[PDB]
């Protein structure tokens, strides 16, 4: 009750990024805080120049039923996955000058929901088999697989320290897992329906889940309980995406009311509507240096705010 | 102008990428996407061509999970193929109740409000030989028809077709499965095209 409210935080669309035609499902920020990657059902994965609203790279796909994409922290590779159970990894920096697919991790049977890099050689995947997995890209086979879900897994995130990861499934449950051994560190519950969006707080001591029951939640990794609930009475639709900012004050939450809401992550009560899409908000991200916010929705337009 | 000698080339690169994206979207925006449920791991995609038309059919029966978190990615399909049998009306697992529940769930779902449905009934010969000694009275005690295939078949057809709650927006094109299936689906999608086409320019 001693925290001052950030108040009304208005933002203006500096850049509208056009070129995606069909629906958009995923986006991730680059490491230099200038490049972007977006995934659509055109079978397209695009790396945008953010400062000048330019296009740096465009990549066609093989399975157009995508649900996720990733950006290598060293800027060398990208990755994607979806309803086809396998995770594809592409090399950006070749003397040939074209992006080539270097690895095809296979061995799942439920639809892939997400994928995030560990370094240039280690990745983590979660699919509809109710199982997560750590893959060693050089070898081509899993080094450890994680079982214990009864429903499909829809999200995961990798810690900044790069030692753990948290997943969430259609069982209204989430699970924190160690990486190099295989144990299930913890299992969280509380949602009234399936969980479809998770994010990892930058300090590595909390995480936030989005649900298809008109609620967002923050849990703590150590206390083993839910911290905060984020919902409003005028809202009846479901969450789709969640992300934080550099300090963490602004929790950007997508919705199905067509309006991204920026929430004051500490007071649990504020809605800085970033209205301006005509459809469902799918994906959203924040730069490493905090210089912008990008949101993408079902209307095929990607917007940059600050 | 506030550019260097090479930012011009950066801009040109972006322009080529935009042209390529637009061309690919034009190429991929004129194909008929049909979803098959029940004729022929993860999505099994099938492609074929008929009368200058590109049919992309989705055989999705290999997934072992529910449809709530999985079906909305098919919002824009032209049509749904539905395949069920008639011979298994009495086999307690029965099967008619399961098929009827599936059809009611599919037809009255929001994503397919304007989306028509093609419906197939197959394994009719086994049904015809069954009714010779196993009439529909085992599964339809209220039925009071003759011991012939035609009356019972019409009864079942009207039973499924009376489940439509969207009579003035989408129809159901029922056909007894017997190459007439391809012709049936082609005519159905032509009529879907016409009805959805004289709708976006008024004309009611």
């Amino acid at each position: 009750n001693n925290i001052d409210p950030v108040g009304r935080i208005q933002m203006r669309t500096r850049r509208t990024l056009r070129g995606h035609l069909a629906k958009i499902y995923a986006m991730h920020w680059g490491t230099d805080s200038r490049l972007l990657v977006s995934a659509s059902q055109d079978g397209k994965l695009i790396i945008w120049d953010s400062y000048t609203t330019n296009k740096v790279h465009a990549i066609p796909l093989r399975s157009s039923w995508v649900m996720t994409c990733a950006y290598a922290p060293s800027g060398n590779y990208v990755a994607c996955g979806g309803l086809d159970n396998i995770c594809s990894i592409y090399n950006l920096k070749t003397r040939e000058g074209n992006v080539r697919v270097s690895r095809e991790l296979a061995g799942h049977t439920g639809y892939l929901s997400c994928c995030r890099f560990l370094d240039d050689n280690q990745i983590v995947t979660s699919s509809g088999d109710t199982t997560c997995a750590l893959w060693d890209i050089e070898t081509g086979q899993q080094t450890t697989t994680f079982t214990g879900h009864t429903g499909d897994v829809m999200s995961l995130s990798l810690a900044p320290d790069t030692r753990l990861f948290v997943s969430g499934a259609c069982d209204a449950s989430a699970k924190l897992w160690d990486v190099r051994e295989g144990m299930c560190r913890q299992t969280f519950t509380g949602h009234e329906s399936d969980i479809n969006a998770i994010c990892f707080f930058p300090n590595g001591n909390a995480f936030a889940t989005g649900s298809d029951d008109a609620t967002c939640r923050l849990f703590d990794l150590r206390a083993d309980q839910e911290l905060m609930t984020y919902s409003h009475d005028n809202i009846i639709c479901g969450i789709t995406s969640v992300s934080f900012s550099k300090s963490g004050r602004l929790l950007l939450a997508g919705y199905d009311d067509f309006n991204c809401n920026v929430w004051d992550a500490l007071k649990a009560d504020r809605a800085g509507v970033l209205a301006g899409h005509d459809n469902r908000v799918s994906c959203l991200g924040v730069t490493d240096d905090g210089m912008a916010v990008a949101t993408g929705s079902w209307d095929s337009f990607l917007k940059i705010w600050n | 102008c506030t550019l260097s000698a090479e930012d011009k080339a950066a801009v040109e690169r972006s322009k080529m990428i935009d042209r390529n994206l637009r061309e690919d979207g034009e190429k991929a925006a004129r194909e008929v996407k049909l979803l098959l449920l029940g004729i022929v791991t993860g999505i099994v995609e099938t492609h074929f061509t008929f009368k200058d038309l590109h049919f992309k059919m989705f055989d999705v029966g290999a997934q072992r999970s529910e449809r709530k978190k999985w079906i909305h990615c098919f919002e824009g399909v032209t049509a749904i193929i539905f395949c069920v049998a008639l011979s298994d009306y009495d086999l307690v697992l029965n099967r008619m109740h399961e098929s009827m529940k599936l059809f009611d769930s599919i037809c009255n779902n929001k994503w397919f409000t304007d989306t028509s449905i093609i419906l197939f009934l197959n394994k009719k010969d086994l049904f015809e030989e069954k009714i010779k000694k196993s009439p529909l009275t085992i599964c339809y005690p209220e039925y009071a028809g003759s011991n012939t295939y035609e009356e019972a078949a019409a009864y079942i057809q009207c039973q499924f077709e009376d489940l439509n709650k969207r009579k003035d927006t989408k129809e159901i094109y029922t056909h007894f499965t017997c190459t007439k299936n391809v012709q049936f689906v082609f005519d159905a999608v032509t009529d879907v095209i016409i009805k959805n086409n004289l709708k976006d320019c008024g004309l009611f």
Partner: single-chain antibody, 232 residues
């Protein structure tokens, strides 16, 4: 990658001559290409430039209206057609790749070069000296001057440092005055201030002596210096 060129030789004054370039082992049609040259006894000179998509075309003021550049993407080939050739045009030429997107490394590969012996406010750079005798085992410091400041509005700087060994073609040591091209030993450096910049080869070893050059790429035309001859 690989770049192999044809057309060199001895040509009479006047007339015309065409030099062709064949690329191998990379995506040819996503690259801009430059034709550069070097005098038989003096430094380098730039000729011409074509960009991605056969759009922008640039020529030097000396060669304007008499040299024309072109490309052919299905067969991965590049052309410089050369009219109005005079005895001052004797040189040996280089075809240089360059990919212009954010963060790329232009001038990262040069061809083997082909000999061709012929029987204003432009920024011209003055090479600071012409010979510095430095024994092996001691660092080498070379500098060059510029006619005009090179900090553009977008925070960039455009100075390039190249090295050439006897009987050889140049390679990219430094691009944009501060960056080190991958594939060369990491004991080089570059620095300096406005219009006055410097290359450094630390802990000189064998096969690390020869001619050194700098370049400006802020606005066309492109020019060069004289080339410091580091000897043993």
């Amino acid at each position: 990658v690989q770049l192999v060129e044809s057309g060199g030789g001895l040509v009479q004054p006047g007339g015309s001559r065409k030099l062709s370039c064949s690329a191998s082992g990379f995506a040819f049609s996503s690259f801009g290409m430059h034709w550069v040259r070097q005098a038989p006894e003096k430094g380098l000179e730039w000729v011409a430039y074509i960009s991605s998509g056969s759009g922008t075309i640039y020529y030097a003021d000396t060669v304007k209206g008499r040299f024309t550049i072109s490309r052919d993407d299905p067969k991965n080939t590049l052309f410089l057609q050369m009219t109005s050739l005079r005895s001052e045009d004797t040189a040996m030429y280089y075809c240089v790749r360059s990919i212009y997107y954010y963060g790329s490394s232009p001038f990262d590969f040069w061809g083997q070069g082909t000999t061709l012996t012929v029987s204003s406010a432009d920024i011209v750079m003055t090479q600071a000296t012409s010979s510095v005798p430095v024994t092996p085992g001691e660092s080498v410091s070379i500098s060059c001057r510029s006619s005009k400041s090179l900090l553009h509005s977008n925070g960039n700087t455009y100075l390039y440092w190249f090295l050439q060994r006897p009987g050889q073609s140049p390679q990219l040591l430094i691009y944009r005055m501060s960056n080190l091209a991958s594939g060369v030993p990491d004991r080089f450096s570059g620095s300096g201030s406005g219009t006055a910049f410097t290359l450094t080869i630390s802990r000189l070893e064998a096969e690390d002596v020869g001619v050194y050059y700098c370049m400006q790429h802020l606005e066309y035309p492109l020019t060069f210096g004289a080339g410091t001859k580091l000897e043993l």
